[PDB]
Design an enzyme around this catalytic site. Structure first.
Site, PDB file in Angstrom:
ATOM      1  N   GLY A 185       3.185   4.342   0.574  1.00  0.00           N
ATOM      2  CA  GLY A 185       4.579   4.370   0.982  1.00  0.00           C
ATOM      3  C   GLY A 185       5.428   3.566   0.037  1.00  0.00           C
ATOM      4  N   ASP A 211       0.978  -6.597 -11.267  1.00  0.00           N
ATOM      5  CA  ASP A 211      -0.168  -6.554 -10.366  1.00  0.00           C
ATOM      6  C   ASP A 211      -0.756  -7.964 -10.167  1.00  0.00           C
ATOM      7  OD1 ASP A 211       0.138  -3.755 -10.219  1.00  0.00           O
ATOM      8  OD2 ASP A 211      -1.494  -3.246 -11.486  1.00  0.00           O
ATOM      9  N   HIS A 219       6.300  -6.691  -5.758  1.00  0.00           N
ATOM     10  CA  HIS A 219       5.441  -5.854  -6.593  1.00  0.00           C
ATOM     11  C   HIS A 219       5.951  -4.404  -6.880  1.00  0.00           C
ATOM     12  CE1 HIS A 219       1.593  -3.459  -7.170  1.00  0.00           C
ATOM     13  NE2 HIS A 219       1.686  -4.283  -8.202  1.00  0.00           N
ATOM     14  N   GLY A 276       0.797  -1.223   0.000  1.00  0.00           N
ATOM     15  CA  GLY A 276       0.000   0.000   0.000  1.00  0.00           C
ATOM     16  C   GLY A 276       0.825   1.267   0.000  1.00  0.00           C
TER      17      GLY A 276
HETATM   18  C1  STE Z   1      -6.512   5.619  -9.527  1.00  0.00           C
HETATM   19  C2  STE Z   1      -7.999   5.888  -9.281  1.00  0.00           C
HETATM   20  C3  STE Z   1      -8.523   5.400  -7.911  1.00  0.00           C
HETATM   21  C4  STE Z   1      -8.842   3.912  -7.916  1.00  0.00           C
HETATM   22  C5  STE Z   1      -9.525   3.454  -6.627  1.00  0.00           C
HETATM   23  C6  STE Z   1      -8.629   2.378  -6.043  1.00  0.00           C
HETATM   24  C7  STE Z   1      -9.073   1.841  -4.685  1.00  0.00           C
HETATM   25  C8  STE Z   1      -8.213   0.659  -4.270  1.00  0.00           C
HETATM   26  C9  STE Z   1      -6.739   1.014  -4.221  1.00  0.00           C
HETATM   27  C10 STE Z   1      -6.073   0.382  -2.990  1.00  0.00           C
HETATM   28  C11 STE Z   1      -5.668  -1.046  -3.265  1.00  0.00           C
HETATM   29  C12 STE Z   1      -4.777  -1.587  -2.136  1.00  0.00           C
HETATM   30  C13 STE Z   1      -3.338  -1.637  -2.564  1.00  0.00           C
HETATM   31  C14 STE Z   1      -2.506  -2.746  -1.979  1.00  0.00           C
HETATM   32  C15 STE Z   1      -1.385  -2.994  -2.946  1.00  0.00           C
HETATM   33  C16 STE Z   1      -0.325  -3.909  -2.371  1.00  0.00           C
HETATM   34  C17 STE Z   1       0.750  -4.143  -3.415  1.00  0.00           C
HETATM   35  C18 STE Z   1       1.766  -3.001  -3.378  1.00  0.00           C
HETATM   36  O1  STE Z   1       1.652  -2.177  -2.378  1.00  0.00           O
HETATM   37  O2  STE Z   1       2.694  -2.799  -4.202  1.00  0.00           O
END
Ligand code: STE
Ligand code: STE
Ligand code: STE
Ligand code: STE
Ligand code: STE
Lengths: 122, 122
Positions: free
Chosen positions: A31, A89, A47, A29
């Protein structure tokens, strides 16, 4: 983009991706990367490295297409950056599902991400 | 209940369940059974037959628990009727996935369901 990523994770794991991963561990997420807390976190590390090698498209913003085929994520389309983005992804979403068995609610809201141990270069 | 059912279908097929199946063919969604139009429709027929086996739970209203594990639907809980109900629902969502290859958009909004040929006994 973030939207595709969040969708893939929801699909593979069944979990609210923002709630379960948006601040998970040191890598998942918001950071940057940091030394992985557990297998889940290591998926997210791999990732973010995957994102680092991309050129020509913006991972967070650029939409790409993929399909859910026999409960398998399949990346769609040619444009070399976007395909590689999709594969990044996909690999994370599968990786997070493979590792739900050790998912730790404890690491879910890691507001201390700035304090994670620095990550090795990709 | 309908909500668990529509969710299992979304999960297996990736398709809007009300839009794809709410009025599909002669068996899917609103109404009773009829002669199935296709593999998809056959899923739904088997499904409605499944529900007739159930005594003392209400398939439309009664919620039950299930989980998504390794991209598999898993039915949760003891209460012999709710268990059988969940297994009915799971079977149909797999069935629909398995048959997406022959899903026909032409059968999607079958307002003509009361004109379906009558179903044979389960
Ligand atoms: C770009 C437009 C907005 C889209 C809405 C998206 C809402 C969901 C986004 C959050 C998803 C959680 C991310 C976790 C990813 C873990 C993998 C990583 O961090 O590299
Ligand atoms: C925009 C990218 C297209 C991705 C294709 C899938 C289309 C919509 C699929 C949404 C449901 C995914 C099925 C996996 C089940 C996860 C459980 C859940 O929906 O809560
Ligand atoms: C701020 C929101 C709190 C938690 C929900 C948002 C999740 C953040 C998504 C960022 C994921 C980044 C994916 C990898 C990367 O682009 O470096
Ligand atoms: C009743 C309260 C729940 C309201 C939430 C709505 C969710 C409804 C989704 C309905 C989708 C049904 C698809 C048709 C199922 C096909 C199998 C069959 O018809 O026997
Ligand atoms: C969508 C509306 C109802 C779907 C039908 C689900 C089961 C059929 C039945 O109760 O016999």
């Amino acid at each position: 983009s973030l939207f595709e990523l969040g969708k893939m994770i929801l699909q593979e794991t069944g979990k609210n991706p923002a709630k379960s991963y948006g601040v998970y561990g040191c890598n998942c997420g918001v950071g940057g990367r940091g030394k992985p807390k557990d297998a889940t976190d290591r998926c997210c590390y791999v990732h973010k490295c995957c994102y680092k090698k991309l050129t020509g498209c913006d991972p967070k913003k650029d939409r790409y297409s993929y399909s859910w085929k026999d409960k398998t994520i399949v990346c769609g389309e040619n444009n070399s950056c976007l395909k590689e983005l999709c594969e990044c992804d996909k690999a994370v979403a599968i990786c997070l599902r493979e590792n739900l068995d050790t998912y730790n609610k404890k690491y879910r809201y890691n507001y201390l991400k700035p304090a994670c141990k620095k990550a090795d270069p990709c």
